[PDB]
């Protein structure tokens, strides 16, 4: 596939990794 | 994987600020293990042959305001090395990877550019204890500065990895043992605060003589290196508000160098100073009472408990800057 | 100290006398004779204070 | 493919086994595992099989890699001393294929040997960390750790790890032999002294050496490490203060000494030229002087954790 | 470790001594004979417990 | 009065440099020679 | 940009429910004031031009079931402009920085 690109999530952090 | 090195070359400045030893009050033992750090392994270099070693680690630590900047702005001055001034904004990437090879690269321009110096200011930010924080980049930002600090087959040795941070509780003890120097710069004493007074006032013509900057000295109690500046500061744009307000001029002894003053005098021209030209301007010179009014109107900013957080960390794990 | 004590106490006092004539300045905007006609008496008594 | 010729290293660097001070049941476990299958290959069929999986914790500074140099050093074989920065990449699918082809590069190099620094760093336990980078690379791991049958002559694994409750169960369990690296005791401590002090010129004797491991109460390797750095520092910041030099004895060997002396020669020190400066000699008092300066980086929350890790997974 | 004891502890003095004198040296930087005329004394006394 | 002033500073300058060889005699000495001058002044 | 929108295109409401100023009893001071600054300068423009300003924020509290949102139906509906109806579901999300930009 693409590149993999980090994300940022909320908690009450994380790494959602959302790729294209 | 030139684009990389294209991102990181941004980091070694070129401008050179002027700070010379000479221009930091105080410190005499921060500044003669920074000296024995750099100047040493550069001028001497027929002293570090076989099992002596330079240091390889410098934690520069202390209150909020009270010159770790100013010395890491000295070394980069009086080094004749290459500086790296990075942050948490020149390491961390956007993709996945590469948060960890601009790390890899940074310290490979360290080791191909050797000898050189790298500093980071506000490590706390990166080594967070890693123990709560940001799985992926606290974990893999954490890890490849302990393994590009020391590791296995990189040998760092050359290279100086100076660190300023205010908040020295907050490492991790993985970096506290890479950090082989923790050094505690205080707030300065009172023959530090006299010549910090020496030095920020400068060449300005004043009437203050060595006994009122003692006395200025002794007044500031507990005041910091960027309190003595804003007071400096103040005392000299003290003069432009006895120029702004107020009224009838006097010429004294050269092309009419008139002088604010009492009203009613011998010449008491009462005119504004905005219709005064340029070049015809002879500012009252700078007194005690200015200096005063500007220690009455400024308040210390470093509170009584950071202090004893410092002095706790000093009597665990640091030494004394002096 | 002491010397620092006398400077600052009567510098403190002209900045007083300063500030209740600015208060009486202030106040005749209002014609307000009453508050004049006293800060601007405050502030003279302190010049003979000093 | 070839990106991974940074990985293992090929200048060896010469820490042997005499180097490392104490630690007699680590060391001879790790000298087992890496001499008796290429020593004797007929003791090591069936049932009794050698250690696949080794794994070293502590505290902070200790030896771990210093371990791992000397394994590096006198094992005779192909070392692969990669960590995260070589497995995860950019793309989907290459962070698998980067351990498929290590291990496979690592089976076609046998006999090699496998050190992972610090490998806490693919292990985030995988609460809610990223998927495709910390799940898939840690199955990987697991899968590619299964060489019990296959990899019964060839590799072996490492680690290093100074926070290891932190650490996944399937990966602890996977790791067999797990050696707890603790504070070094006085006779390592009287060993280390004299292996940093080495080859320089001294008076210090073995009772001052006892007394120095006696001083160090609760020191680690890195800290005796700096202590003797500073004293080696010392006779250099006592020649930097200048006052008196007094030569001594070939071709001019000067020697700063006490003011008001016979032959107190009153010059600088840069004026000279290089090697006609006879430095002083180690006492025993700047050792002192750096006792008193460095501190223990170690607190007593890591050793009471080290503890409970140690009496929970001994 | 009482040998080690009083070679720090003599060490520790003269390390105080050579501070007394540095501050007395500091001292004069502002002419206070006062101060100086203390610490250079301070030290002495101890250069003499020693 | 300046020069007798320094000439103090040289001194216990002197002596804390003869400390530094544990040299007690020559630092007994000039912290002396030292201290009577600043009483000369 | 074009998300953003999509998600607060829903908050906009065109159904207008049917509830008059005659459908609530009492309450004539808050009738008057929401009344006056919705109606007066939609209906008369030329009566704030300059130094008079209308009402730019007006808080509705009290106790629970005291006909506050039926009072804001009744201003959605004869308010005649375009009503936005927000809550906790629109504004916050998931992402980092995302309820701001919202
Ligand atoms: N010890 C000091 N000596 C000289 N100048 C100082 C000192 N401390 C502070 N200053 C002045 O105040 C400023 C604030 O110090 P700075 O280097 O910015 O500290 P920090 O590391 O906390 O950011 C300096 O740039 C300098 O102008
Ligand atoms: N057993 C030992 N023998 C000799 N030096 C040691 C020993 N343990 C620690 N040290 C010293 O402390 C350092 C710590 O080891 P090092 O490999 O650098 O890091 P780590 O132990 O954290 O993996 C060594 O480089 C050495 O200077
Ligand atoms: N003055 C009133 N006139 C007409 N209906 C009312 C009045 N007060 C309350 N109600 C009725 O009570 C219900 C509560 O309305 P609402 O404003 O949603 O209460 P709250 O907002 O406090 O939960 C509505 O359905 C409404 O029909
Ligand atoms: F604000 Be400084 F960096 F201590
Ligand atoms: F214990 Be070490 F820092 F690997
Ligand atoms: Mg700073
Ligand atoms: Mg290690
Ligand atoms: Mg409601």
Redesign the interface.
């Given at each position: 596939?693409?590149?993999?690109?980090?994300?940022?999530?909320?908690?009450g952090x994380x790494x959602x990794x959302x790729x294209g | 994987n030139k684009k990389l090195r294209g991102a990181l070359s941004s980091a070694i400045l070129s401008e050179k600020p002027n700070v010379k030893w000479e221009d930091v009050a105080g410190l005499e033992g921060a500044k003669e293990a920074l000296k024995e750090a750099v100047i040493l392994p550069v001028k001497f270099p027929h002293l570090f042959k076989g099992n002596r070693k330079p240091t390889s680690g410098i934690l520069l630590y202390g209150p909020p305001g009270t010159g770790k900047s100013y010395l890491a702005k000295a070394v980069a001055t009086e080094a004749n090395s290459t500086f790296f001034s990075v942050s948490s904004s020149d390491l961390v990437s956007k993709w996945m990877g590469e948060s960890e090879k601009l790390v890899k690269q940074l310290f490979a321009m360290a080791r191909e550019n050797k000898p050189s110096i790298i500093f980071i200011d506000e490590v706390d930010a990166l080594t967070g204890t890693r123990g709560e924080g940001e799985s992926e980049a606290s974990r893999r930002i954490k890890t490849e500065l302990l393994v590009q600090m020391n590791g296995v087959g990189n040998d760092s040795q050359g290279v100086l990895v100076l660190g300023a941070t205010n908040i020295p509780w907050q490492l991790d003890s993985a970096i506290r043992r890479r950090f082989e120097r923790r050094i505690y710069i205080p707030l300065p004493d009172l023959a530090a605060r006299t010549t910090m007074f020496e030095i920020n006032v400068g060449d300005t013509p004043c009437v203050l003589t060595k006994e009122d900057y003692r006395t200025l000295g002794a007044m500031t109690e507990g005041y910091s290196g960027s309190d003595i500046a804003v007071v400096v500061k103040d005392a000299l744009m003290q003069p432009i508000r006895k120029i702004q307000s107020a009224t009838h001029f006097k010429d004294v002894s050269e092309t009419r160098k008139l002088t604010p003053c009492s009203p009613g005098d011998d010449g008491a021209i009462e005119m504004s100073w905005t219709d005064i030209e340029a070049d015809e301007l002879k500012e009252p010179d700078l007194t005690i009472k200015d200096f005063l009014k500007a220690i009455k109107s400024t308040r210390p900013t470093v509170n009584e408990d950071d202090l004893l957080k410092q002095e706790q960390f000093t009597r665990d794990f640091g030494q004394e800057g002096n | 100290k002491d010397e620092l004590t006398k400077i600052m106490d009567r510098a403190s006092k002209i900045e007083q006398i300063q500030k209740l004539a600015k208060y009486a300045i202030s106040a005749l905007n209002y014609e307000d004779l009453p508050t004049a006609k006293d800060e601007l008496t405050k502030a003279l008594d302190l010049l003979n204070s000093i």
């Amino acid at each position: 596939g693409g590149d993999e690109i980090v994300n940022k999530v909320l908690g009450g952090x994380x790494x959602x990794x959302x790729x294209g | 994987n030139k684009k990389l090195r294209g991102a990181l070359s941004s980091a070694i400045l070129s401008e050179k600020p002027n700070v010379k030893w000479e221009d930091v009050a105080g410190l005499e033992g921060a500044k003669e293990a920074l000296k024995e750090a750099v100047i040493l392994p550069v001028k001497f270099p027929h002293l570090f042959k076989g099992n002596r070693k330079p240091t390889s680690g410098i934690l520069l630590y202390g209150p909020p305001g009270t010159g770790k900047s100013y010395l890491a702005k000295a070394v980069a001055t009086e080094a004749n090395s290459t500086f790296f001034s990075v942050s948490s904004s020149d390491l961390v990437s956007k993709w996945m990877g590469e948060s960890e090879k601009l790390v890899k690269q940074l310290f490979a321009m360290a080791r191909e550019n050797k000898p050189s110096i790298i500093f980071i200011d506000e490590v706390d930010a990166l080594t967070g204890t890693r123990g709560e924080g940001e799985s992926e980049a606290s974990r893999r930002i954490k890890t490849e500065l302990l393994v590009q600090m020391n590791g296995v087959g990189n040998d760092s040795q050359g290279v100086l990895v100076l660190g300023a941070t205010n908040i020295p509780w907050q490492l991790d003890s993985a970096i506290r043992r890479r950090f082989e120097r923790r050094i505690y710069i205080p707030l300065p004493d009172l023959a530090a605060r006299t010549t910090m007074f020496e030095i920020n006032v400068g060449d300005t013509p004043c009437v203050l003589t060595k006994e009122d900057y003692r006395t200025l000295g002794a007044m500031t109690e507990g005041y910091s290196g960027s309190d003595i500046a804003v007071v400096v500061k103040d005392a000299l744009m003290q003069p432009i508000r006895k120029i702004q307000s107020a009224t009838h001029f006097k010429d004294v002894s050269e092309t009419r160098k008139l002088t604010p003053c009492s009203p009613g005098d011998d010449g008491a021209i009462e005119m504004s100073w905005t219709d005064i030209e340029a070049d015809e301007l002879k500012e009252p010179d700078l007194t005690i009472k200015d200096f005063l009014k500007a220690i009455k109107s400024t308040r210390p900013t470093v509170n009584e408990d950071d202090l004893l957080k410092q002095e706790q960390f000093t009597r665990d794990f640091g030494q004394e800057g002096n | 100290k002491d010397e620092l004590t006398k400077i600052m106490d009567r510098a403190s006092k002209i900045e007083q006398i300063q500030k209740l004539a600015k208060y009486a300045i202030s106040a005749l905007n209002y014609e307000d004779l009453p508050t004049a006609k006293d800060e601007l008496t405050k502030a003279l008594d302190l010049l003979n204070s000093i």
